[PDB]
Amino acid sequence: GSSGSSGTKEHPFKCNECGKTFSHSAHLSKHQLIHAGENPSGPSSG
Ligand SMILES: [Zn+2]
């Protein structure tokens, strides 16, 4: 058949923390640092 029913979001890199997608890894890896607390909280509320 085919690997990827959906049309868009066909990037080889997909974040598992949120569910994002990046064409290149460098982008993902970098976008991952955001999940590892890399900014001062504020308006956040759990
Ligand atoms: Zn993410």
Swiss-Prot record:
A zinc finger (C2H2-type) spans 13-35. It is found in: Nucleus. Involved in histone 3'-end pre-mRNA processing by associating with U7 snRNP and interacting with SLBP/pre-mRNA complex. Increases histone 3'-end pre-mRNA processing but has no effect on U7 snRNP levels, when overexpressed. Required for cell cycle progression from G1 to S phases. Belongs to the krueppel C2H2-type zinc-finger protein family. Interacts with the SLBP/pre-mRNA complex but not with SLBP alone. Interacts with LSM11 in a U7 snRNP-dependent manner. The C2H2-type zinc finger 2 to 6 are necessary and sufficient for discrete Cajal bodies localization. The C2H2-type zinc finger 5 to 10 are necessary and sufficient for interaction with LSM11. The C2H2-type zinc finger 2 to 8 are necessary for interaction with the SLBP/RNA complex in the histone pre-mRNAs. The C2H2-type zinc finger 2 to 10 confer activity in histone pre-mRNA processing. This is Zinc finger protein 473. The lineage of its organism: Eukaryota, Metazoa, Chordata, Craniata, Vertebrata. The gene is ZNF473.
